[PDB]
Amino acid sequence: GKLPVPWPTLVTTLVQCFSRYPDHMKRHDFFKSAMPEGYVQERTISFKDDGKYKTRAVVKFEGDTLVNRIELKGTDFKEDGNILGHKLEYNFNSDNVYITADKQKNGIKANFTVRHNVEDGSVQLADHYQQNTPIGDGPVLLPDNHYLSTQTVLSKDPNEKRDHMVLLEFVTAAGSASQGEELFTGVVPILVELDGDVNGHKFSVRGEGEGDATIGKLTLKFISTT
């Protein structure tokens, strides 16, 4: 079957612990400090003049594998809009994601807008609100204000018959300190599992790959089931 939404609209939902934090910023890496116990990451993604995604994810280690388990609920979408109508370009341009501390949740938050190119030349906006909280009771690092700058390229496996997305992504923070930071000194296998429902259309996505936080690099292949 076919994914009922464009693959670019799921990129931000489908592991910021793999961002490269420079040495002078290691004291501000909340994402790694919450590991291995993990953190909960919740988002609302409002597509302008269209529907919304509500997501809740658990990001934690299972053995040496970093696992991202997500539940996605999409509502109020137009069957003929840019999302359900598959009208977006197959790409994903750069973002500066400003991270701020959420003191009383012992975590972080962020608000940023993603710009998806539409095939007719217009742009589809996706307003992200994000909240992260740690799962364990151990100490975590609460950061000063900073941001993560991203680069992403999407491609296809020419022999893969299933609906799928190959992703390569580099992320650096700008603008050990924790036991969890040490878990990311090398290449870490990644598994992502998303269960989705958009306007009643159910689907699931599984991705496999690896991340290298020393250079901020993510390589993943996602496959959808519908």
PDB file of C-alpha atoms in Angstrom:
ATOM      1  CA  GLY A   1       0.000   0.000   0.000  1.00  0.00           C
ATOM      2  CA  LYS A   2       0.832   3.704  -0.200  1.00  0.00           C
ATOM      3  CA  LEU A   3       1.534   6.090   2.655  1.00  0.00           C
ATOM      4  CA  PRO A   4      -1.511   8.407   2.917  1.00  0.00           C
ATOM      5  CA  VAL A   5       0.698  11.457   3.628  1.00  0.00           C
ATOM      6  CA  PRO A   6       3.856  12.797   1.965  1.00  0.00           C
ATOM      7  CA  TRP A   7       7.098  11.409   3.352  1.00  0.00           C
ATOM      8  CA  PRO A   8       8.583  14.913   3.981  1.00  0.00           C
ATOM      9  CA  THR A   9       5.783  15.663   6.487  1.00  0.00           C
ATOM     10  CA  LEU A  10       7.002  12.798   8.728  1.00  0.00           C
ATOM     11  CA  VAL A  11      10.716  13.690   8.767  1.00  0.00           C
ATOM     12  CA  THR A  12      10.647  15.704  12.001  1.00  0.00           C
ATOM     13  CA  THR A  13       8.597  12.991  13.723  1.00  0.00           C
ATOM     14  CA  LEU A  14      10.815  10.114  12.549  1.00  0.00           C
ATOM     15  CA  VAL A  15      16.243  11.419  17.501  1.00  0.00           C
ATOM     16  CA  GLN A  16      17.904  14.709  18.408  1.00  0.00           C
ATOM     17  CA  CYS A  17      20.325  12.860  20.709  1.00  0.00           C
ATOM     18  CA  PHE A  18      22.362  12.403  17.498  1.00  0.00           C
ATOM     19  CA  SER A  19      22.970  16.125  17.011  1.00  0.00           C
ATOM     20  CA  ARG A  20      26.625  17.120  17.176  1.00  0.00           C
ATOM     21  CA  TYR A  21      27.217  19.283  20.244  1.00  0.00           C
ATOM     22  CA  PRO A  22      30.618  21.042  20.124  1.00  0.00           C
ATOM     23  CA  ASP A  23      32.911  20.774  23.127  1.00  0.00           C
ATOM     24  CA  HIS A  24      32.002  24.207  24.524  1.00  0.00           C
ATOM     25  CA  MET A  25      28.314  23.171  24.403  1.00  0.00           C
ATOM     26  CA  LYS A  26      28.444  19.673  25.915  1.00  0.00           C
ATOM     27  CA  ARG A  27      26.973  21.038  29.164  1.00  0.00           C
ATOM     28  CA  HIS A  28      23.817  21.958  27.192  1.00  0.00           C
ATOM     29  CA  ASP A  29      23.050  18.550  25.615  1.00  0.00           C
ATOM     30  CA  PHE A  30      19.807  17.534  27.310  1.00  0.00           C
ATOM     31  CA  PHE A  31      19.059  14.799  24.773  1.00  0.00           C
ATOM     32  CA  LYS A  32      22.113  12.660  25.523  1.00  0.00           C
ATOM     33  CA  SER A  33      21.990  13.327  29.277  1.00  0.00           C
ATOM     34  CA  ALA A  34      18.562  11.652  29.516  1.00  0.00           C
ATOM     35  CA  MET A  35      19.962   8.393  28.063  1.00  0.00           C
ATOM     36  CA  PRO A  36      19.844   5.407  28.425  1.00  0.00           C
ATOM     37  CA  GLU A  37      16.591   5.746  30.390  1.00  0.00           C
ATOM     38  CA  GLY A  38      15.278   8.032  27.653  1.00  0.00           C
ATOM     39  CA  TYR A  39      12.876  10.903  27.217  1.00  0.00           C
ATOM     40  CA  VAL A  40       9.297  11.468  26.098  1.00  0.00           C
ATOM     41  CA  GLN A  41       8.940  13.756  23.064  1.00  0.00           C
ATOM     42  CA  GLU A  42       5.513  15.219  22.288  1.00  0.00           C
ATOM     43  CA  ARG A  43       4.587  17.504  19.402  1.00  0.00           C
ATOM     44  CA  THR A  44       1.697  19.283  17.749  1.00  0.00           C
ATOM     45  CA  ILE A  45       2.306  20.030  14.060  1.00  0.00           C
ATOM     46  CA  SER A  46      -0.254  22.430  12.575  1.00  0.00           C
ATOM     47  CA  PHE A  47      -0.283  22.554   8.776  1.00  0.00           C
ATOM     48  CA  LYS A  48      -1.493  26.009   7.757  1.00  0.00           C
ATOM     49  CA  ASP A  49      -4.946  25.902   6.124  1.00  0.00           C
ATOM     50  CA  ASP A  50      -5.031  22.128   6.698  1.00  0.00           C
ATOM     51  CA  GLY A  51      -4.866  19.453   9.397  1.00  0.00           C
ATOM     52  CA  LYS A  52      -2.715  18.804  12.450  1.00  0.00           C
ATOM     53  CA  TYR A  53      -0.437  16.016  13.656  1.00  0.00           C
ATOM     54  CA  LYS A  54      -0.347  15.151  17.356  1.00  0.00           C
ATOM     55  CA  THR A  55       2.609  12.926  18.234  1.00  0.00           C
ATOM     56  CA  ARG A  56       3.924  11.251  21.380  1.00  0.00           C
ATOM     57  CA  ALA A  57       7.213   9.360  21.235  1.00  0.00           C
ATOM     58  CA  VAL A  58       9.384   7.400  23.646  1.00  0.00           C
ATOM     59  CA  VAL A  59      13.094   7.612  22.778  1.00  0.00           C
ATOM     60  CA  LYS A  60      15.281   5.226  24.770  1.00  0.00           C
ATOM     61  CA  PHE A  61      17.852   2.457  24.495  1.00  0.00           C
ATOM     62  CA  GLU A  62      16.977  -1.222  24.194  1.00  0.00           C
ATOM     63  CA  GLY A  63      20.329  -2.864  24.595  1.00  0.00           C
ATOM     64  CA  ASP A  64      22.737  -0.872  22.451  1.00  0.00           C
ATOM     65  CA  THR A  65      19.986   0.170  19.995  1.00  0.00           C
ATOM     66  CA  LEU A  66      18.451   3.642  20.201  1.00  0.00           C
ATOM     67  CA  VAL A  67      14.698   3.158  19.703  1.00  0.00           C
ATOM     68  CA  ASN A  68      12.142   5.814  18.685  1.00  0.00           C
ATOM     69  CA  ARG A  69       8.563   4.560  19.219  1.00  0.00           C
ATOM     70  CA  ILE A  70       5.924   7.026  18.015  1.00  0.00           C
ATOM     71  CA  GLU A  71       2.139   7.309  18.029  1.00  0.00           C
ATOM     72  CA  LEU A  72       0.796   9.821  15.500  1.00  0.00           C
ATOM     73  CA  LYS A  73      -2.758  11.150  15.233  1.00  0.00           C
ATOM     74  CA  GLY A  74      -3.688  13.404  12.309  1.00  0.00           C
ATOM     75  CA  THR A  75      -7.035  15.207  12.144  1.00  0.00           C
ATOM     76  CA  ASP A  76      -8.883  17.914  10.201  1.00  0.00           C
ATOM     77  CA  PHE A  77      -7.014  17.306   6.945  1.00  0.00           C
ATOM     78  CA  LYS A  78      -8.401  18.157   3.519  1.00  0.00           C
ATOM     79  CA  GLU A  79      -8.650  15.096   1.305  1.00  0.00           C
ATOM     80  CA  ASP A  80      -7.738  17.440  -1.590  1.00  0.00           C
ATOM     81  CA  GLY A  81      -5.121  19.515   0.247  1.00  0.00           C
ATOM     82  CA  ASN A  82      -1.363  19.384  -0.148  1.00  0.00           C
ATOM     83  CA  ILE A  83      -0.980  16.565   2.399  1.00  0.00           C
ATOM     84  CA  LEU A  84      -3.671  13.989   1.650  1.00  0.00           C
ATOM     85  CA  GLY A  85      -3.423  14.969  -2.032  1.00  0.00           C
ATOM     86  CA  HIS A  86       0.352  14.282  -2.197  1.00  0.00           C
ATOM     87  CA  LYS A  87       1.285  17.701  -3.602  1.00  0.00           C
ATOM     88  CA  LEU A  88       4.673  18.262  -1.898  1.00  0.00           C
ATOM     89  CA  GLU A  89       8.163  18.015  -3.380  1.00  0.00           C
ATOM     90  CA  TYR A  90      10.322  15.082  -2.253  1.00  0.00           C
ATOM     91  CA  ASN A  91      12.912  17.076  -0.323  1.00  0.00           C
ATOM     92  CA  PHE A  92      13.477  18.702   3.060  1.00  0.00           C
ATOM     93  CA  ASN A  93      15.303  22.012   3.389  1.00  0.00           C
ATOM     94  CA  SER A  94      17.319  23.410   6.290  1.00  0.00           C
ATOM     95  CA  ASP A  95      15.981  24.516   9.671  1.00  0.00           C
ATOM     96  CA  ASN A  96      17.287  26.373  12.699  1.00  0.00           C
ATOM     97  CA  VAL A  97      15.484  24.791  15.672  1.00  0.00           C
ATOM     98  CA  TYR A  98      15.745  27.002  18.759  1.00  0.00           C
ATOM     99  CA  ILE A  99      15.957  24.944  21.965  1.00  0.00           C
ATOM    100  CA  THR A 100      14.893  26.431  25.300  1.00  0.00           C
ATOM    101  CA  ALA A 101      14.866  24.957  28.782  1.00  0.00           C
ATOM    102  CA  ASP A 102      11.551  23.823  30.303  1.00  0.00           C
ATOM    103  CA  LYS A 103      12.606  24.062  33.939  1.00  0.00           C
ATOM    104  CA  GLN A 104       9.515  22.755  35.721  1.00  0.00           C
ATOM    105  CA  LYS A 105       9.270  19.761  33.388  1.00  0.00           C
ATOM    106  CA  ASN A 106      13.024  19.160  33.858  1.00  0.00           C
ATOM    107  CA  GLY A 107      13.363  19.134  30.068  1.00  0.00           C
ATOM    108  CA  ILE A 108      13.291  21.338  26.966  1.00  0.00           C
ATOM    109  CA  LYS A 109      10.825  22.836  24.493  1.00  0.00           C
ATOM    110  CA  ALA A 110      10.947  24.280  20.979  1.00  0.00           C
ATOM    111  CA  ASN A 111       8.729  26.110  18.498  1.00  0.00           C
ATOM    112  CA  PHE A 112       9.683  26.178  14.817  1.00  0.00           C
ATOM    113  CA  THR A 113       8.028  26.292  11.396  1.00  0.00           C
ATOM    114  CA  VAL A 114       8.954  23.906   8.576  1.00  0.00           C
ATOM    115  CA  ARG A 115       8.525  25.066   4.957  1.00  0.00           C
ATOM    116  CA  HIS A 116       7.485  22.283   2.554  1.00  0.00           C
ATOM    117  CA  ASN A 117       7.711  23.113  -1.154  1.00  0.00           C
ATOM    118  CA  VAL A 118       4.467  22.466  -3.061  1.00  0.00           C
ATOM    119  CA  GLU A 119       4.617  21.151  -6.626  1.00  0.00           C
ATOM    120  CA  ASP A 120       2.860  24.291  -7.934  1.00  0.00           C
ATOM    121  CA  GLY A 121       5.525  26.656  -6.563  1.00  0.00           C
ATOM    122  CA  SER A 122       3.783  27.626  -3.323  1.00  0.00           C
ATOM    123  CA  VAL A 123       4.948  26.656   0.182  1.00  0.00           C
ATOM    124  CA  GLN A 124       3.129  24.599   2.827  1.00  0.00           C
ATOM    125  CA  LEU A 125       3.903  25.692   6.393  1.00  0.00           C
ATOM    126  CA  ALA A 126       4.070  23.232   9.306  1.00  0.00           C
ATOM    127  CA  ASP A 127       4.032  24.865  12.760  1.00  0.00           C
ATOM    128  CA  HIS A 128       5.863  22.675  15.307  1.00  0.00           C
ATOM    129  CA  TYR A 129       5.429  22.885  19.073  1.00  0.00           C
ATOM    130  CA  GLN A 130       7.673  20.465  20.958  1.00  0.00           C
ATOM    131  CA  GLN A 131       8.103  19.331  24.562  1.00  0.00           C
ATOM    132  CA  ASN A 132      10.616  16.808  25.920  1.00  0.00           C
ATOM    133  CA  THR A 133      10.796  15.359  29.444  1.00  0.00           C
ATOM    134  CA  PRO A 134      13.175  12.717  30.827  1.00  0.00           C
ATOM    135  CA  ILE A 135      11.974   9.261  31.824  1.00  0.00           C
ATOM    136  CA  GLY A 136      14.594   8.405  34.448  1.00  0.00           C
ATOM    137  CA  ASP A 137      15.081  10.160  37.768  1.00  0.00           C
ATOM    138  CA  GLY A 138      18.825  10.652  37.285  1.00  0.00           C
ATOM    139  CA  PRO A 139      20.356  14.084  36.746  1.00  0.00           C
ATOM    140  CA  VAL A 140      19.931  15.689  33.326  1.00  0.00           C
ATOM    141  CA  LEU A 141      21.411  18.799  31.736  1.00  0.00           C
ATOM    142  CA  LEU A 142      19.113  21.795  31.294  1.00  0.00           C
ATOM    143  CA  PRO A 143      20.472  24.009  28.503  1.00  0.00           C
ATOM    144  CA  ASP A 144      20.894  27.681  27.951  1.00  0.00           C
ATOM    145  CA  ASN A 145      19.165  28.992  24.839  1.00  0.00           C
ATOM    146  CA  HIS A 146      20.716  27.614  21.651  1.00  0.00           C
ATOM    147  CA  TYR A 147      19.665  26.093  18.342  1.00  0.00           C
ATOM    148  CA  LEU A 148      20.213  23.084  16.097  1.00  0.00           C
ATOM    149  CA  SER A 149      20.916  23.657  12.400  1.00  0.00           C
ATOM    150  CA  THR A 150      19.925  20.825  10.057  1.00  0.00           C
ATOM    151  CA  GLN A 151      20.566  19.472   6.555  1.00  0.00           C
ATOM    152  CA  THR A 152      18.631  16.582   4.995  1.00  0.00           C
ATOM    153  CA  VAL A 153      18.536  14.743   1.659  1.00  0.00           C
ATOM    154  CA  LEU A 154      15.792  12.279   0.688  1.00  0.00           C
ATOM    155  CA  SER A 155      16.192   9.568  -1.952  1.00  0.00           C
ATOM    156  CA  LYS A 156      14.767   6.259  -3.178  1.00  0.00           C
ATOM    157  CA  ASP A 157      16.175   2.738  -3.459  1.00  0.00           C
ATOM    158  CA  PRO A 158      15.589   1.953  -7.162  1.00  0.00           C
ATOM    159  CA  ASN A 159      14.992  -1.737  -6.369  1.00  0.00           C
ATOM    160  CA  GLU A 160      12.680  -1.234  -3.353  1.00  0.00           C
ATOM    161  CA  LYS A 161       9.110  -1.921  -4.479  1.00  0.00           C
ATOM    162  CA  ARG A 162       7.554  -0.825  -1.189  1.00  0.00           C
ATOM    163  CA  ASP A 163       6.707   2.774  -0.346  1.00  0.00           C
ATOM    164  CA  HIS A 164       9.812   4.040   1.414  1.00  0.00           C
ATOM    165  CA  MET A 165      12.161   6.933   2.158  1.00  0.00           C
ATOM    166  CA  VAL A 166      15.962   6.861   2.337  1.00  0.00           C
ATOM    167  CA  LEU A 167      17.210   9.672   4.576  1.00  0.00           C
ATOM    168  CA  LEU A 168      20.603  11.251   5.260  1.00  0.00           C
ATOM    169  CA  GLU A 169      20.815  14.072   7.787  1.00  0.00           C
ATOM    170  CA  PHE A 170      23.470  16.253   9.462  1.00  0.00           C
ATOM    171  CA  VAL A 171      22.671  18.324  12.567  1.00  0.00           C
ATOM    172  CA  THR A 172      24.948  20.595  14.627  1.00  0.00           C
ATOM    173  CA  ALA A 173      24.172  22.619  17.753  1.00  0.00           C
ATOM    174  CA  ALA A 174      25.246  26.272  17.852  1.00  0.00           C
ATOM    175  CA  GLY A 175      24.451  29.625  19.437  1.00  0.00           C
ATOM    176  CA  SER A 176      32.026  13.855  29.986  1.00  0.00           C
ATOM    177  CA  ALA A 177      29.335  16.349  31.007  1.00  0.00           C
ATOM    178  CA  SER A 178      26.954  13.412  31.541  1.00  0.00           C
ATOM    179  CA  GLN A 179      27.064   9.631  31.666  1.00  0.00           C
ATOM    180  CA  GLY A 180      24.612   9.547  28.762  1.00  0.00           C
ATOM    181  CA  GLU A 181      26.957  11.538  26.522  1.00  0.00           C
ATOM    182  CA  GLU A 182      29.423   8.628  26.577  1.00  0.00           C
ATOM    183  CA  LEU A 183      26.814   6.357  24.960  1.00  0.00           C
ATOM    184  CA  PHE A 184      27.218   8.319  21.693  1.00  0.00           C
ATOM    185  CA  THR A 185      30.997   8.331  21.160  1.00  0.00           C
ATOM    186  CA  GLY A 186      30.588   5.811  18.325  1.00  0.00           C
ATOM    187  CA  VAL A 187      28.116   4.531  15.731  1.00  0.00           C
ATOM    188  CA  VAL A 188      24.787   3.622  17.344  1.00  0.00           C
ATOM    189  CA  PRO A 189      22.160   1.407  15.647  1.00  0.00           C
ATOM    190  CA  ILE A 190      18.705   2.990  15.423  1.00  0.00           C
ATOM    191  CA  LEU A 191      15.204   1.535  15.174  1.00  0.00           C
ATOM    192  CA  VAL A 192      12.120   3.720  14.587  1.00  0.00           C
ATOM    193  CA  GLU A 193       8.527   2.470  14.859  1.00  0.00           C
ATOM    194  CA  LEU A 194       5.612   4.772  14.035  1.00  0.00           C
ATOM    195  CA  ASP A 195       1.930   3.896  14.312  1.00  0.00           C
ATOM    196  CA  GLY A 196      -0.183   6.464  12.515  1.00  0.00           C
ATOM    197  CA  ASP A 197      -3.807   7.413  11.877  1.00  0.00           C
ATOM    198  CA  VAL A 198      -4.611  10.417   9.657  1.00  0.00           C
ATOM    199  CA  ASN A 199      -8.316  11.206   9.131  1.00  0.00           C
ATOM    200  CA  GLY A 200      -9.061   7.572   9.974  1.00  0.00           C
ATOM    201  CA  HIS A 201      -6.492   6.234   7.488  1.00  0.00           C
ATOM    202  CA  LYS A 202      -4.217   3.914   9.471  1.00  0.00           C
ATOM    203  CA  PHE A 203      -0.599   3.176   8.591  1.00  0.00           C
ATOM    204  CA  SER A 204       2.725   2.272  10.160  1.00  0.00           C
ATOM    205  CA  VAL A 205       6.369   3.031   9.385  1.00  0.00           C
ATOM    206  CA  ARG A 206       9.516   1.124  10.341  1.00  0.00           C
ATOM    207  CA  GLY A 207      12.980   2.581   9.907  1.00  0.00           C
ATOM    208  CA  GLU A 208      16.405   1.074  10.457  1.00  0.00           C
ATOM    209  CA  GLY A 209      19.853   2.612  10.315  1.00  0.00           C
ATOM    210  CA  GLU A 210      22.454   4.251  12.526  1.00  0.00           C
ATOM    211  CA  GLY A 211      23.610   7.550  13.955  1.00  0.00           C
ATOM    212  CA  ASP A 212      27.044   9.047  14.569  1.00  0.00           C
ATOM    213  CA  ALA A 213      26.753  11.937  17.027  1.00  0.00           C
ATOM    214  CA  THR A 214      30.484  12.766  16.861  1.00  0.00           C
ATOM    215  CA  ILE A 215      29.790  14.112  13.354  1.00  0.00           C
ATOM    216  CA  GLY A 216      26.023  14.613  13.727  1.00  0.00           C
ATOM    217  CA  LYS A 217      25.151  12.146  10.952  1.00  0.00           C
ATOM    218  CA  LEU A 218      21.970  10.062  10.601  1.00  0.00           C
ATOM    219  CA  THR A 219      21.405   7.382   7.952  1.00  0.00           C
ATOM    220  CA  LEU A 220      18.016   5.644   7.914  1.00  0.00           C
ATOM    221  CA  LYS A 221      15.694   3.789   5.550  1.00  0.00           C
ATOM    222  CA  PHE A 222      11.968   3.909   6.331  1.00  0.00           C
ATOM    223  CA  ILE A 223       9.306   1.566   4.929  1.00  0.00           C
ATOM    224  CA  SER A 224       5.555   2.092   5.242  1.00  0.00           C
ATOM    225  CA  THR A 225       2.738  -0.426   5.689  1.00  0.00           C
ATOM    226  CA  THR A 226      -0.849   0.525   4.869  1.00  0.00           C
TER     227      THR A 226
END
